């Protein structure tokens, strides 16, 4: 179990396409950037992450993420959050262009991040194996305080289920 | 004239002048802005002749826009023997300009 | 090669969800389906397929796919083209996304298929290695007439170049 | 009432009535028209109780729901001695009362 122990960052990395609304004040196109699981972790003080296992599948998108955007404004200034990151283990393209389907404007406080082949997910045991060697990320919560995992669980049954990777779950481990 | 950059070696040597003022359009061919800031860099690089003009796609030379942590386009790099003094991200005209100007 | 011999379907199978005008008129929501590859060309006189590396991407976005919906009413009534599949190693429902951004209103002739951990393309040889093992699909396009491969063809440098694998090129070999 | 069904055993002997009606309504939890739908099947429930109304949720019962073919929400399906006579695919009330009437 993760909990009560330094956040396993090794050499994982996410790769991410920004959004904002001030570097649409100077209009450019966005790229992929790559980022250091530990550098993320070691620059922000209070971390939220949350997996979910493919961009634009229903539950993901009706149920599941929403609730991350709806409480953004609140966890940052209210729960002192710095970092919230949705990962999936799809292309950043995609999932860049989910987040604004999803009413994301700024990826100053959220970003979504794809971390290739599941390696970082699976990892710390959130996988979900989808056949034949495919795996997804299941459906997960994570908060990081201080680079030490204070809260991670995953869900039994994740294509139904938001209980434990709800943010209403996070909230109270804040 | 604006003069495109195709590999490492070009970019290196571009940035090997020393003292003379280079200037570095990273564009993608896809990319709206950059399109649109294009016809407007072979402007300044008329007006400023005293300064060396080029461009580089991001997606045929993505070594060297990683390097340069450009992760955005355009993005327009000023460089004085061979290191960045400035940058200017996004298609801005105005600061593109004054970003020439006080290094040339 | 590929070219002159049998489409080398075997036992690989592909997702993809279906867009319809008229299963709107019956409004439901869609889910994933499998597909046999063997089953779609032994069922389809005439099939073209292209490959692209990544869903939402920019290259695959404006300068590659949209040719093939453009042309699409010309494929099937004056070149007699029975299906279009788009594949991708994406997900199917960020796959459905990106075909309703490109503009498809219904799939009966044009399918956007998921090609998981890219079995089918990296068994053809049109596989793009993207890192720590892990496989997006090249950019490519085939024509399949009565179950026989009579072009195919991949991008050298995929990110950036739509020429054999443009609908243009397809098209001349119609 | 229409009572869920919630794995392959339950769908199973719910199919394995006999003579008697049954219809399933596989739906989604997240789906527009599935909710839409569903206080009308407890209303067709009521209406035709020489028929049995049930409703199996597609994403926890995954394995049903591809056996049938199902591959949208609301499909209900009418089984008459464990086979299938026939599917309306969507919410349509009309073509769903329909079903009903010329089958029970």
């Given at each position: 179990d993760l909990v009560n122990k330094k956040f396993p960052a090794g050499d994982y990395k996410f790769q991410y396409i920004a959004i904002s609304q001030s570097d649409a004040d100077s209009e450019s196109c966005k790229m992929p950037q790559t980022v250091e699981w530990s550098k993320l972790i070691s620059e922000n003080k209070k971390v939220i992450i949350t997996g979910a296992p493919?961009?634009?599948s229903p539950t993901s998108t009706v149920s599941h993420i929403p609730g991350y955007i709806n409480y953004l404004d609140e966890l940052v200034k209210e729960k002192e959050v710095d970092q919230v990151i949705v990962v999936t283990v799809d292309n950043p393209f995609a999932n860049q262009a989910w987040a604004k389907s999803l009413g994301v404007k700024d990826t100053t406080h959220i970003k979504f991040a794809s971390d290739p082949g599941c390696a970082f997910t699976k990892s710390i045991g959130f996988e979900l194996a989808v056949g034949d060697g495919v795996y997804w990320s299941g459906r997960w919560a994570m908060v990081v305080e201080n680079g030490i995992v204070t809260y991670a669980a995953k869900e039994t049954?994740?294509?139904?289920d938001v209980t434990v990777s709800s943010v209403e779950s996070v909230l109270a481990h804040l | 004239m604006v003069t495109q950059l195709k590999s490492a070696s070009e970019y290196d040597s571009a940035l090997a002048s020393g003292d003379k003022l280079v200037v570095v359009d990273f564009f993608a061919t896809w990319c709206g802005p950059s399109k649109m800031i294009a016809p407007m860099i072979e402007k300044f690089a008329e007006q400023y002749s005293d300064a060396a003009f080029y461009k580089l796609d991001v997606d045929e030379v993505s070594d060297v826009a990683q390097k340069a942590e450009?992760?955005?386009?355009p993005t327009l790099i000023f460089y004085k023997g061979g290191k960045e003094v400035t940058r200017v991200v996004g298609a801005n005209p105005a600061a593109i300009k004054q970003a020439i100007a006080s290094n040339v």
């Open positions: 493919a961009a634009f049954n994740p294509g139904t | 450009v992760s955005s386009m």
